[PDB]
Subunit: 529 residues, 3 copies
Amino acid sequence: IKRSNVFAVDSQIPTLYMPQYISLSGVMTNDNQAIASFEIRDQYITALNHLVLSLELPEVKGMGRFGYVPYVGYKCINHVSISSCNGVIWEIEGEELYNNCINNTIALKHSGYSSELNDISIGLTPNDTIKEPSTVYVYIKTPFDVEDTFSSLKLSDSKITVTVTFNPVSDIVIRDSSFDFETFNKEFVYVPELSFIGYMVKNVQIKPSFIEKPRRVIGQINQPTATVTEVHAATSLSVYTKPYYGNTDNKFISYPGYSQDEKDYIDAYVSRLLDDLVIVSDGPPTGYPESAEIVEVPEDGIVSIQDADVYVKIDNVPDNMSVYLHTNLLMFGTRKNSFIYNISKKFSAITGTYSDATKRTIFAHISHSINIIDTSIPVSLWTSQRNVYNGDNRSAESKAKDLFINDPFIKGIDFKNKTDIISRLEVRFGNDVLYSENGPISRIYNELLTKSNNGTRTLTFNFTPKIFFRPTTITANVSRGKDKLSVRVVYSTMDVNHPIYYVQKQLVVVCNDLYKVSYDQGVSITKIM
Amino acid sequence: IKRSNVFAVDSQIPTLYMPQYISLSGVMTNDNQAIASFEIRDQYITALNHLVLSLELPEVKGMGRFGYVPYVGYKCINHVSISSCNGVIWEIEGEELYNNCINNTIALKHSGYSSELNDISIGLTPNDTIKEPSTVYVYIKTPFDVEDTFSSLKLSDSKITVTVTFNPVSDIVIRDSSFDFETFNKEFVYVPELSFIGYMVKNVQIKPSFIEKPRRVIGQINQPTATVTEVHAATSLSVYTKPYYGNTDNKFISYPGYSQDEKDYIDAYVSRLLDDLVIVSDGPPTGYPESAEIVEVPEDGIVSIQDADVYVKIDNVPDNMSVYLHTNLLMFGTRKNSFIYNISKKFSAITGTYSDATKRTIFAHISHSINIIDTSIPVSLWTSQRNVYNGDNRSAESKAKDLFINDPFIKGIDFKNKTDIISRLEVRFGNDVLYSENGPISRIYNELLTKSNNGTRTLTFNFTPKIFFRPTTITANVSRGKDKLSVRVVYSTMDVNHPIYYVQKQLVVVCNDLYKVSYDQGVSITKIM
Amino acid sequence: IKRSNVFAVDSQIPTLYMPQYISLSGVMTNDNQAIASFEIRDQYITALNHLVLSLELPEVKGMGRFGYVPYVGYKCINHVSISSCNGVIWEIEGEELYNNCINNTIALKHSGYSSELNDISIGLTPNDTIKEPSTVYVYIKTPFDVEDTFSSLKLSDSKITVTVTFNPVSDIVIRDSSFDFETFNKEFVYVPELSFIGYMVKNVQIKPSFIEKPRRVIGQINQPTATVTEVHAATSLSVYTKPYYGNTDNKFISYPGYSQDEKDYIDAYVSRLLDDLVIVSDGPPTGYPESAEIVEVPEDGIVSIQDADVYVKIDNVPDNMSVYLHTNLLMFGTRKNSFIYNISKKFSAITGTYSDATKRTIFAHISHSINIIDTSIPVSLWTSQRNVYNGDNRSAESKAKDLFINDPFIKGIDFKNKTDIISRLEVRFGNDVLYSENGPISRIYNELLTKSNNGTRTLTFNFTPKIFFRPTTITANVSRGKDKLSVRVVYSTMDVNHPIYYVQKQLVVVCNDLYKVSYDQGVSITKIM
């Protein structure tokens, strides 16, 4: 019995090298999209990987409510490209980069995720500081990071250029109307610095490698189809939907800030609704539109709103004041005398205590049925032409606290991507059906295999180890016409009298193509056919 | 100096294959245990792994309090078996499957763990919907998943059958007496679908492999011994205890629902006790049994309960009402005039405010010594024959809110498996002592080595990589009689006047046997001797 | 096309061995530092790894406030050394051991991290039990654990000695002045037990290996320089700063106990300040020093404190009482009529309700600007000679609740190591500059590469797999004088009128040297040159 020794190893002497952390400042150029270019030319840098982008956010002064989106560093990136003299080596969109890093909690934390950055801070005077200057770090995960020095990008005596395109500053900022965003936008400038790990290698022996490069296709608005052409060697395919808020002003009622659980979203929304829902006043409350229906709460504390009973009990109400309930705070309906969507009927029990000192109701326990979709409705959709009612019956004070939100990486139709609006998915390679499903079993598989919490519907064709094998791909057959991937979905049917039915959707299809990387005459890549 | 190249690899071309996600519907057969069978016969399916079971839970309508246990998908599974024409290939119990997946947070989340499923929802009218229809996904982790395609189950032109046995629906449901469980049970049916990843391989070269199959032995009620016979090649051995609630009605006072921390359990329990503990009333409170001792709280706010001082201060008590304290809410004792277990003496400070509108006391800060064992006591044990007192002096209203809980995967004597009731463990291989310990150092080691939070006392005999080596086992010596593993424990001594002393216990011993998998004449396994 | 089989393996038969868990009691010897020695001499133990130290903490009785620091098991360890007959094989400081385990959440949990151990418990009578006896487990991670049996420490027929030096018990205890620490210290004794996994190997074939041993250098108080000499083969270098609280009594105002978030620290601090900040009294509040400035809150609820407006609104104040605000609770300043640091001016809105029953103010919402540095100020620094004011104007009651905290593993100048006090870092190998940076990009890299949340500024020179290659090092050139590593930093500039400016700092430099491990004539190590 010849036995393999599992208590000792014969240590290999590795290639002689020395690593170094290297920072570079960029050249910035500019609706004038901001672009940073970083030039890497150094004869003693043989390979590199682990790119990190530094961004200095400035001091924010003035009046209004201002905050940064979570993961602001990732969300300010529109596009990243690595090139040489022979053309582009590897590139990615900001959405797909953020997708690839969504499971790296450390990287997400470094890119800007804290109370200081992401709470909605309030400025009271034109000289009040709303945010202090800060620095975020964006880990640009590339295929050259999977196996450390084995997968690194070798600079075969070539000059490597890294180009970063930035999103407009309105994408990364949550603000109210009181904040002077025009001035802020005129003054804001991205200040980037690029870092990487370089390797000074002694007598490097270079071999050709393989690289996967994502390619992204967005369908037209509300179409259930998208197609990616010229597919010859794909390792994976993923499909998801994005909301198109272009038909709105991008104003929402609430945003939970640094708290990012579904419960947190719902709590912020309910908190914003309670100030206009239950009113302690001397006589009929004033300052609400004519369409508002404010009723007094009887001695039994129960108000009926057409099949719905709301239980209101407030402590310490003065003897000259009564408790009032808003029975149609937000209303939606497409036909005049049919079903109505009423945000007031989603409450069952409201208790609290009136404060004589601050003249407010401090709410204690609330029983309600608000979900994430309601927190995700845009304010424009409550008052669209299709609504036969006056949708928004809130006070002017609460109307003034709505927030502009322009986050570019939102999936689905809600902030959490919690509702699945795809009820059937079909993929075709050429004309034949490659995959079909009704439930999200492919998303279950993507999450199980990548150990992620925010998976998408994904067909993965590669199950081999990463760089020590050539990746397994679905291969084209141009003779039989199998050279394109077509995706058709069936959207989940929503009620025509729910405002979320009118959020516009786009289908996104991402394809990972296989490329050969060769190192004769500098660095170059060729698409595998 | 010959140096190993650590900056380049020679990529191997792997076996030509194509993966595919495959779903199957089953054949259901039926105290009529429900059994689902899934048949896999497909000539182009060469291998498979990554089994996922889909379960559609129906709409739940009616009155009462209803909820699902956490991880309902895992808890509805009694047994899973994979077979071919030559017999069983691999099988497992539901408890051990859940044990093997306890460290996979993604899988646990997919099997049904959310507020919507696990809050105890309340139905008010016979047409109220308590739960909406939902789908859970149970990842059935098999030994064929450890190394992706290397460890996959090859179908040597054989038909593979997957059989799932389900637990009764009462195991996965938390309910009160007001819910119509008889009708619910008559109507509930499991609707399962089986998914796996199949591989269509071109010219597969098959080699024999090794597989570990768990074998489970449960000792008799309250015996400190269990033995597993016919042990010839075990890779690991684990020991834990389970509570036997068969001598009870399985009714508990509280359950925290979706919150699953120890603090959450304790908070739910204290919340259920406070409504009968402190009473604001006009005169001596009514509606309590004769054995209740309700005393008025003096001006200093301190009530003495035999060496115990409780500090009660309630704000806003009306002038016609007084504050009362329940001094023997739950009581236990075995001898008439000796030590008594009194749930009231476990409180030291109770403060709150009376609400005139809702006629309740809203409690603020509470100081207490309630632990997890108290939340884990069954209501039947408070009123057993051995209790010389009337144990339960609660109001009928609170008595009506007790929950039936029949969770099948509970370890220890509390819901969290927090108390260790094993004070000494001894394992014998044959007649010789193989292992001995007093503290839980083997559980510490199991958690450290498996990177788990819910480890058990485990002897692992294998420290070699998984599939690239033959596993290391403890080998039998039938000549010397070393062919069985005997386990004897010494239970921690509990006080005879604590009700948890009378919870019945079973010892569970799990043994992982090594099997050879061969592929001539289809798939077959043979026990290593 | 020769294809590598990725669906089958040729299983290797490994070395024949049998593992066993082994516990040992020690020999304890003793300002009399406690030292435990464990002797391992057993002919059938061929290798070992995975050391775990058991510690029994006793019952704590008496009066006062008492608690254990988080991770008490790690914090009681001063030094660990593994030796043979040829000298020390491997050793480490307690700080660096805890650093190496900071990312192992399971190990941190096992070493003592729970509400029961880490809440500040209160003893009321001299016989009250503050803490029950408990056992913690400290995983002593060694280089012999990285690759299981491949990296294990082989005992070439040698006797191995493990020696543990313990910190004084005052390092692991958080206490007030009311606790009798002199008696506690006279009675406390460490009771340790050592566990490891031993391997009984049949015909072991031993080969020489490599090991990295940390070496630690602490700079002098407040010097921005430190140097590690005799550096010939280092795999990594890390730099951080520690606070020196020797010029204080080590008393702080608050400690959050088991809650260990920054928000938790701030909340505990604000809670301790509110009792003296806002006072509901009949007339000017009494019991405060003469330097206190207590003003009555006007009808509009706004008090001005030199450019700062505090909004105070308390409900249910009796008609004979008024609301008062402490305008200089904690004050600091170095010049008589210049800038002042006033803890009262860091509040903007204070609301709450007075309780007539308990005669206290129960605070509801608070708006403030307290940060982690304020919670990290020592009480001695408020009343130093450099303060031209009476710094601490709190009541005697709150002064009596300050806690002694002597935690030995604190980094930076705050409890969370959140503020970076290093604005520039430079490393020199010999006289040449090896590395330079202004921001913490090296800490970003350390966290990204080690997947940690508490990284330090680190230069790592090794990117090769751990034990199957010889590690890559930065190599000395004694001819050119490159045989020492010098570190110089520039500290962040703090305001001279902030008390945190006067916390003393030490620079810590840790170097990982490469050693050869050989097994002829027992175990021995030699420093690589």
